[PDB]
Design a protein around this ligand. Sequence first.
Ligand SMILES: [Cl-]
Lengths: 109, 108
Amino acid sequence: AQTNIDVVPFNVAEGKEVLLVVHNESQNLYGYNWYKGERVHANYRIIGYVKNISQENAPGPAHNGRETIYPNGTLLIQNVTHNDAGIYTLHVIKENLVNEEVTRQFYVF
Amino acid sequence: QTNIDVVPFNVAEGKEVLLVVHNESQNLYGYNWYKGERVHANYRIIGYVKNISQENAPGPAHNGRETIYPNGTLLIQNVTHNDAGIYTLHVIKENLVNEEVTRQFYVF
Ligand SMILES: [Cl-]
């Protein structure tokens, strides 16, 4: 994958904010979706973003209400809870549909 | 909401199979097929991009025998025993509220 993701901090205090920072400079991106877990599947979708409209899409079944997605794909989670800990998967949707999946994790203390 | 008919479900080696896609949606961006149960780049066969009316580049799971049509239908010719198994379609919507559909066929 071309996309890099840097989750900061890796261990987050309860009540604090976590960023899953996405670095992909490509000029041919269509958009993004984030999932909770290792799998790209609708049942685990959190939130996504469509670049040409500059808009978030509908919240997915896995959304906690505290996420914000940014136009470069980065995910913010505010006021983290213990249940937010675990595995996160970004699907980068390219205009040519040659897509990529990148999985990271963070934990909460 | 996406239906897929496997035609036929039990396939003779060396014959052809269709994964026939029925989806009436008017906000489709395109499609990708994968070998296996999961949407993952390492298993991608091929896709189709609607706004340019073209197949995209073959993926790692492409064997040179697979054709994708504009509605997402997949044709596999000259089927081998290795082609048998689980296939997953990822239906990409303009709003990125996407859908994953899995089917299977057997080879004899
Ligand atoms: Cl998890």
